[PDB]
Design a protein around this ligand. Sequence first.
Ligand SMILES: O=C(O)CNC(=O)C(=O)O
Ligand SMILES: [Mg+2]
Ligand code: NI
Ligand SMILES: [Zn+2]
Length: 331
Amino acid sequence: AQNPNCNIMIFHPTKEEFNDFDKYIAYMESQGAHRAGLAKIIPPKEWKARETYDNISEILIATPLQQVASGRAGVFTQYHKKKKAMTVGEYRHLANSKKYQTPPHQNFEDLERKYWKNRIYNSPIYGADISGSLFDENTKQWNLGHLGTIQDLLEKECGVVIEGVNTPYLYFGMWKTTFAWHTEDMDLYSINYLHLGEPKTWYVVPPEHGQRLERLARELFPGSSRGCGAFLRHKVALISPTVLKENGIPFNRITQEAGEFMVTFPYGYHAGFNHGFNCAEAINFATPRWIDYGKMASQCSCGEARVTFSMDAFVRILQPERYDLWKRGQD
Ligand SMILES: O=C(O)CNC(=O)C(=O)O
Ligand SMILES: [Mg+2]
Ligand code: NI
Ligand SMILES: [Zn+2]
């Protein structure tokens, strides 16, 4: 069995190996990458996403989200308070302001310490989940706007044609902006490209150990657990590495820098934070190996998790027994 300790693997494909996306994902899995839940892909040196980032300031962040925390430093939830619209230029200025900018630090490890110590005492503003793309239409390799769609994958594997579309999302981050512990909708893969700016630190639990994280989460967030049997789908709960170590949950951590891709694998729980002003692009995708995870994915039916149009068909076809109850949650 490849990669039995479930370490995060880093890949350096050649330009020739960067042509065929599906084939490279399948190569990575042949080497055990999926066992970690997360992999890093450094593109060939010849590759670029686009020529420059000099003309992005007029993108609109229609609903910036202020991430307000409650709890203790290592075990907290966050809620998202909607703020007034602002452009990317306005947001970048705010990120760089004395109130919100990254503090002086020695290295990534010192910054990580400061994050876990102090995150709860501040409420950073995240421009998340903005439909769109920063890949140039002429970038032919690993262009997240030109991937094969999940609906076409389901059709190719299972023969059923379904409605729905699959498009990327932009994330504009600042210091302390935070992604809570989650897997993807329907336990899909995700791919994330950091286009510009400061790094993003990731934590991940191997898929084979996801249920250990869930059991801890039910203990640490007992009211949330009673409210919903899949409350991590709400994407609001944070647990520090110190807390995970104290409770013996297996995990790994890695920092993504500008110009690098990360891939999350089916049922790989992940969380993390941004180091300063940045912009990432991400999209879900599927492979043949995903199908069995989609059939087994937990679902939120309490009404909180509220998701895309396109998840309807996945639940309807892969989880017909759950469909009625899940749809009640959606309506
Ligand atoms: O970058 C972020 O805020 C969150 N991204 C992801 O969870 C992902 O790419 O799967
Ligand atoms: Mg612009
Ligand atoms: Ni994710
Ligand atoms: Zn729920």
